[PDB]
Amino acid sequence: LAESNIKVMCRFRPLNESEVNRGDKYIAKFQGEDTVVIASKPYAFDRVFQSSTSQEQVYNDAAKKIVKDVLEGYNGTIFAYGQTSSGKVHTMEGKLHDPEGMGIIPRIVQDIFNYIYSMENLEFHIKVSYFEIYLDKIRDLLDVSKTNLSVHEDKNRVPYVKGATERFVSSPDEVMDTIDEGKSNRHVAVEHSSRSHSIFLINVKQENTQTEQKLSGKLYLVDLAGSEKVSAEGAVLDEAKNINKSLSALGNVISALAEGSTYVPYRDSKMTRILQDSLGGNARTTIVICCSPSSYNESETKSTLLFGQRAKT
């Protein structure tokens, strides 16, 4: 199909108490349930979550329908974009298995398994893959001896990563441990800042024994490393230029879709080529951009919001 259906959503965290003492202003105005005003500039979105909004409700509005569609055979992608101390990890992971405080990913894992456990004539297979785009290279986060993987396309023109590690999982914890293993292998540097973009893949295969009909859906979880304004003046500079280039290539595709372009330049980067069949078209997408309301951050929460704006129609 040719919908476009990409939604961008912004979640502001509470300034916390320790940031309120160091001396700061809240610098974030809201009007509508979907617009935010910083420095008297309005930024419109599909949805804006303020500090009082629970984890469950960000999951219900960003992810819950994407998961449903994957359990129905479709593809989907979720992006998490944020600068450091924006509330990204809290939003994506949170305190997992506090049922009130877990973020997006753990609720996704439990909604998949509650769906499975809820079914006799239905056979399942969940494959998880986990890799990163670091310095334009695809590294496997589940098998670190595999540092430079390639993208190819099969007979049906759907893209794949030759050699990426696929793990079969059968329980919510077996999924969370695969994720923790990968995280220890991601490129981080300097506070704790992602030097790469990570892609987590949940592939949910189903077979119905009586109708002998099959289903197969791909859910991608992409953690975007924040953009850097960078002038080691060497290996780190390389890291920053690639982060920015691949984000701009991503923006280009996303914006082509949102603006109803009839040529969406997927081929331009490895990440958008990998996610080609899960970005746009009959696939559903949510970009969650996380921002700090804090004044200390106003220069770059402005930059985050501008990035989110690239996805507005």
Curated annotation (Swiss-Prot):
Biological process according to GO: anterograde axonal protein transport; anterograde dendritic transport of neurotransmitter receptor complex; anterograde neuronal dense core vesicle transport; axon guidance; cellular response to type II interferon; centrosome localization; cytoplasm organization; lysosome localization
Kinesin motor domain segment(s): 5-313
Subcellular location: Cytoplasm, Cytoskeleton; Cytolytic granule membrane; Lysosome membrane
Cross-link (Glycyl lysine isopeptide (Lys-Gly) (interchain with G-Cter in SUMO2)): K205
MF-aspect GO terms: ATP binding; ATP hydrolysis activity; cadherin binding; identical protein binding; microtubule binding; microtubule motor activity; plus-end-directed microtubule motor activity; protein-containing complex binding
Chief location: cytoplasm
Superkingdom of origin: Eukaryota
GO CC annotation terms, alphabetical: axon cytoplasm; centriolar satellite; ciliary rootlet; cytolytic granule membrane; cytoplasm; cytosol; dendrite cytoplasm; kinesin complex
Positions contributing to ATP binding: G82, Q83, T84, S85, S86, G87, K88, V89
Assigned keywords, A-Z: Acetylation, ATP-binding, Coiled coil, Cytoplasm, Cytoskeleton, Isopeptide bond, Lysosome, Membrane, Methylation, Microtubule, Motor protein, Nucleotide-binding, Phosphoprotein, Ubl conjugation
Record's comment describing the protein's domains: Composed of three structural domains: a large globular N-terminal domain which is responsible for the motor activity of kinesin (it hydrolyzes ATP and binds microtubule), a central alpha-helical coiled coil domain that mediates the heavy chain dimerization; and a small globular C-terminal domain which interacts with other proteins (such as the kinesin light chains), vesicles and membranous organelles.
Function: Microtubule-dependent motor required for normal distribution of mitochondria and lysosomes. Can induce formation of neurite-like membrane protrusions in non-neuronal cells in a ZFYVE27-dependent manner. Regulates centrosome and nuclear positioning during mitotic entry. During the G2 phase of the cell cycle in a BICD2-dependent manner, antagonizes dynein function and drives the separation of nuclei and centrosomes. Required for anterograde axonal transportation of MAPK8IP3/JIP3 which is essential for MAPK8IP3/JIP3 function in axon elongation.
Family: Belongs to the TRAFAC class myosin-kinesin ATPase superfamily. Kinesin family. Kinesin subfamily.
Subunit and partners: Oligomer composed of two heavy chains and two light chains. Interacts with GRIP1 and PPP1R42. Interacts with SYBU. Interacts with JAKMIP1. Interacts with PLEKHM2. Interacts with ECPAS. Interacts with ZFYVE27. Found in a complex with OGT, RHOT1, RHOT2 and TRAK1. Interacts with APP (via cytoplasmic domain).
Protein name: Kinesin-1 heavy chain
Complete-protein stretch covered: 4 to 324 of 963
